[PDB]
């Protein structure tokens, strides 16, 4: 694959954003996507940089740095005569299962540790299309990225330390969570954990934290190994292919199924993945997956287990918001407990705003905000990036926060399913209808918009209402975002969703979200006493309805979708 001239003309480009003269006082913080690329493309980053006349840059040993440590980094590191980075380039796609012939996608985070903003990165589009000369010269240094310390150079006060690349996050999640509760969790004779990372950046972190910071035998860590995958593993949780944390657990690519590893003493009862890049992340327990929307909940209904939410005299947890296309259990969660939600649209902007309110710009002064979005990750204001490793601590001290020395401990299973029972359950899953034509696709959105617009009360089930195309106006910066999902909402809280995913010229695809809530067959009683009926086959009705309304059968000629979630 290939671009425009090389690719530092991006370097140069978000320094074409913030306008000159710095002279010699900025600091950067460089590191990204664990392989393939990086080593030979982050020399270029320093030599456009140097050339530019930023003062410093902090680049991650070996070049590695997961996404959340990058935020960390930027937003809580001060030392070596005491500076702050005010802001930094990741080396990430995130959304790209492989990288042959050094396919490239980079990433800048501005001075609050987050993604820049939309006014910023949409500036950049400009540059990095009609630059029309860069400016690198070589002169020509060339560090070390793979030996600690600290680089000074010529003809500009020009300085690269390589700092140790996990050493800052390990410490803020040994702050945010009581590790001596989780140890007791782990270092237990009746708890077997699986951790699997992809062979991605989020590797080495799981190393430094579950087995030097918990005491998790290194046996139960997995492919926790940076590297370049050319025939496997996709660095996207999901149930297919990826079905190996999946499989260990004793699941089929088909969401919660079971075939033959029923009575194993061999299952552990917790596992869980981690996105290429750290940022997301897949939770999972002994035969049981937890939706991502379900697991935000979860860690909302129990976040009196961290002492970050719990400590600092705070109010136990005042704030929660999340992707529109994601579930509503959190919802539900907001409900039993008077902290205020909020339903965005999709891009981290909105999480970034709400989030900078009680440092930067009004708006409600507490911020302890948790955050979430289906395609999973989720996060909180710890820091300006949704991280995974996080969460997997998150659920841990829920779990440990438990008591059970001696006696058993309740399984994850339980846990969702107690909170299935205190709550009601929201089922989810998503339907997805790839290569149709944009025609029919439209033609698909216009319809579920239009013939349900002008007939509120169509169709089946209970009252239908509150269908609109879902338009969001940002409280924080008062921005308007339009277009972002069809709605149909139902009266008990189900809804069905269409939202439209295409870049380009390339057909494009149906996202058919399908979410049905029901409090009956429960509560308190473990297990609805053997009448488990389970999401997939309740969500038969809205599946017949939404299909029914869309007319998406008759205008895409697709009896099934493509994925299944
Ligand atoms: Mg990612």
New binding site residues.
Partial sequence: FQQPNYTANFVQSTFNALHRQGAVPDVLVVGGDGRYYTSEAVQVILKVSAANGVRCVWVGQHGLLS?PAVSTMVRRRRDADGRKATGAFIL?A??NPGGPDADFGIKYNSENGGPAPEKLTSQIYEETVKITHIKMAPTLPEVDIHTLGTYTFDDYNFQVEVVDSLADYAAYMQEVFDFEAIRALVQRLDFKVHVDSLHGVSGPYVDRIFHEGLGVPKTSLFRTNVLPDFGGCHPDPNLTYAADLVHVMGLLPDGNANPAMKHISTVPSFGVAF??????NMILGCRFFVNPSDSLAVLAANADCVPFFTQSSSSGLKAVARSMPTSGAVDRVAAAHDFALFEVPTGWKFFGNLMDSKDLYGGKDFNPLLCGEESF?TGSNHIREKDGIWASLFWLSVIAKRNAPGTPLVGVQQIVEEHWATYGRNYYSRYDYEDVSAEAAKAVMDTVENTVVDDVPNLNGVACKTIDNFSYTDPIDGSVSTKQGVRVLFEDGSRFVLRLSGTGSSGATIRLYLEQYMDSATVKSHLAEKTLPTASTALKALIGVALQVSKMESLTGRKTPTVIT
């Fill in positions: 996404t990430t995130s959304h996105d290429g890049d750290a940022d997301r990750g």
